[PDB]
């Protein structure tokens, strides 16, 4: 029994989901999937930006193995030989399907997909936004539209409703073949463009506004100035903090976008059920990184903060699997770089060298004692590399000279009962033991005596 695999890969989604205890998000379909599988409460990405995270997941290698830490370098523009998920699965007789945003750069492994539906550009459906963009074009400006939109339109008026349609159609086409399918939903990546009915699930005035406070004694480059959001029309670019109203509009759009994607997940799951595929298809729900919607008064991703590195991850084994677990959580420390070797083991394949490990054991036995650490990186240009570790309770981050490995700053954040911490405890005499333990874990992954970090990003 080799199962099929269906992966919902959601862009820019932190665990803002009912099943993860969100008191705000309305996510009935994803919550139902969690009642049918194992929910990982301590899952972490290897860099909190799209391109490195996704190529790391799709190759089972960490960003610091690939040397790619920014957004302008397709995997295959540097590393043509490392074996990826679609390559390995296609060679092993599976149909391989990419819908929506899977690799950040759609050219990567394009020929390794037997069925390929490109990620699509953003759509603004409100005539006012269409007119803004028209006035840009008749002004010579390439500039973004607004950061969100709430048009009173059918689901297929934005790209994720279309992705769901392609997934439903392709499941019908491939129903008697072994397949692995990635359905890459793009929201809630900016702009937060989703139909009105999903906005109408929320009142912007109900959202709590996060405190406009940076962590005390943070490293100076711990957080960005959220250039990504500043690029959208209507976002002031000259202020530390956004106002309450705009903050609420953005929080509202992120939530509306999540509920929109939740409905699209439901459509694909309904087709999987109607086609009789649930009996032999494992379903994975995952994200490329976390996100900030006003936390620390900041926005977007692009850090080693807990809120940016922690992601949802739900795995539901096919319904014919005798050992399947449903409706249980796992606190095992797991990584997105583990997904590829997990799939290798699940589908009985011989896989390539990997920087992760299979978590199939924990999918079947969620309380199995598991790993001591999960690690990530984040580059601040070519000269500075942040490297971070969590044990599930504390996060420890060193910002190093990327050549010499010297520490430029260090951070220690407690995360026992919150994804946020407002106090860097590094150097605090009360936390010497925690700092030493976390530093040892970090240094095992990131030695100081093996030379510079690899650097392979290109223009
Ligand atoms: Ca992303």
Curated annotation (Swiss-Prot):
Role of this protein: Sulfatase involved in ulvan degradation. Ulvan is the main polysaccharide component of the Ulvales (green seaweed) cell wall. It is composed of disaccharide building blocks comprising 3-sulfated rhamnose (Rha3S) linked to D-glucuronic acid (GlcA), L-iduronic acid (IduA), or D-xylose (Xyl). The sulfatase is most active on ulvan polymers, particularly on xylose-rich ulvan. It can desulfate oligosaccharides containing the motif Rha3S-Xyl2S-Rha3S and thus likely proceeds in an endolytic mode of action, removing sulfates from xylose residues in periplasmic oligosaccharides.
Cofactor detail note: Binds 1 Ca(2+) ion per subunit.
Modification 3-oxoalanine (Cys) occurs at: 50
Active site per UniProt: 50 (nucleophile), 104
A molecular function (GO) term: iduronate-2-sulfatase activity
Pfam families: Sulfatase (PF00884)
Gene3D superfamilies in alphabetical order: Alkaline Phosphatase, subunit A (3.40.720.10)
Enzyme class: hydrolase
Organism whose genome encodes this protein: Formosa agariphila (strain DSM 15362 / KCTC 12365 / LMG 23005 / KMM 3901 / M-2Alg 35-1)
PANTHER family tied to this protein: IDURONATE 2-SULFATASE
Name listed for the protein in its UniProt record: Ulvan-active sulfatase
Family: Belongs to the sulfatase family.
Intracellular or extracellular location(s): Periplasm
Entry's EC annotation: 3.1.6.-
Species classification: Bacteria, Pseudomonadati, Bacteroidota, Flavobacteriia, Flavobacteriales
Inducers of expression: By ulvan and rhamnose.
Entry keywords, A to Z: Calcium, Hydrolase, Metal-binding, Periplasm, Signal
Matching CDD domains: iduronate-2-sulfatase
Residues annotated for Ca(2+) binding in this entry: 11-12, 50, 288-289
CC annotations in GO: cytoplasm; periplasmic space
Known cofactor(s): Ca(2+)
Record's comment on post-translational modification: The conversion to 3-oxoalanine (also known as C-formylglycine, FGly), of a serine or cysteine residue in prokaryotes and of a cysteine residue in eukaryotes, is critical for catalytic activity. This post-translational modification is severely defective in multiple sulfatase deficiency (MSD).
């Amino acid at each position: 029994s080799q199962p099929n695999v269906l992966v919902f890969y959601v862009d820019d989604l932190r665990a803002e989901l009912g099943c993860y205890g969100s008191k705000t998000a309305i996510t009935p379909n994803i919550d139902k999937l969690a009642t049918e599988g194992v929910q990982f409460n301590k899952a972490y990405v290897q860099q909190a930006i799209c391109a490195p995270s996704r190529m790391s997941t799709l190759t089972g290698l960490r960003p610091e193995t690939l040397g790619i830490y920014s957004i302008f370098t397709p995997l295959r523009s540097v590393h043509k030989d490392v074996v990826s998920v679609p390559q390995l699965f296609k060679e092993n007789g599976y149909k391989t399907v990419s819908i929506g945003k899977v690799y950040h750069h759609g050219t990567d492994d394009k020929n390794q997909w037997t069925n390929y539906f490109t990620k699509e550009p953003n759509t603004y459906n409100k005539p006012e936004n269409i007119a803004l963009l028209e006035q840009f074009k008749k002004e010579g400006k390439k500039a973004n539209g607004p950061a969100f939109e709430n048009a009173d339109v059918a689901d297929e008026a934005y790209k994720d409703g279309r992705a769901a349609k392609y997934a439903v159609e392709t499941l019908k086409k491939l129903k008697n073949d072994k397949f692995i399918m990635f359905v890459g939903f793009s929201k809630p990546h900016l702009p937060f463009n989703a139909p009105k009915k999903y906005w109408d699930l929320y009142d912007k005035n109900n959202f709590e506004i996060p405190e406009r406070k940076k962590p005390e004694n943070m490293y100076r480059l711990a957080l960005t100035n959220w250039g990504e959001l500043k690029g959208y029309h209507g976002i002031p670019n000259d202020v530390e903090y956004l106002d309450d109203n705009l903050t609420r509009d953005l929080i509202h759009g992120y939530h509306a976008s999540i509920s929109y994607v939740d409905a699209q997940v439901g459509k694909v799951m309904e087709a999987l059920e109607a086609l009789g595929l649930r009996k032999n298809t494992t379903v994975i729900f995952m994200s490329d990184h976390g996100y900030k919607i006003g936390e620390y008064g900041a926005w977007c991703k692009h850090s080693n903060e807990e809120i940016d590195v922690r992601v949802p991850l739900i795995v539901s084994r096919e319904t014919s699997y005798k050992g399947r677990v449903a409706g249980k959580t796992s606190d095992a420390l797991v990584e997105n770089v583990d997904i590829f070797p997990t799939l290798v083991e699940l589908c009985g394949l011989e896989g390539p060298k990997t920087d992760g490990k299979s978590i199939l054991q924990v999918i079947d036995r969620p309380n199995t004692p598991w790993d001591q650490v999960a690690t990530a990186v984040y580059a601040r240009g070519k000269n500075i590399m942040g490297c971070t570790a969590t044990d599930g309770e504390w996060r420890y981050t060193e910002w190093r000279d990327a050549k010499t490995q010297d520490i430029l700053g260090a951070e220690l954040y407690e995360h026992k009962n919150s994804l946020l911490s407002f106090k860097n405890l590094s150097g605090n005499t009360k936390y010497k033991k925690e700092e030493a333990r976390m530093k040892g874990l970090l240094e095992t992954q990131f030695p100081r005596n093996q030379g510079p970090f690899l650097q392979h990003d290109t223009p």
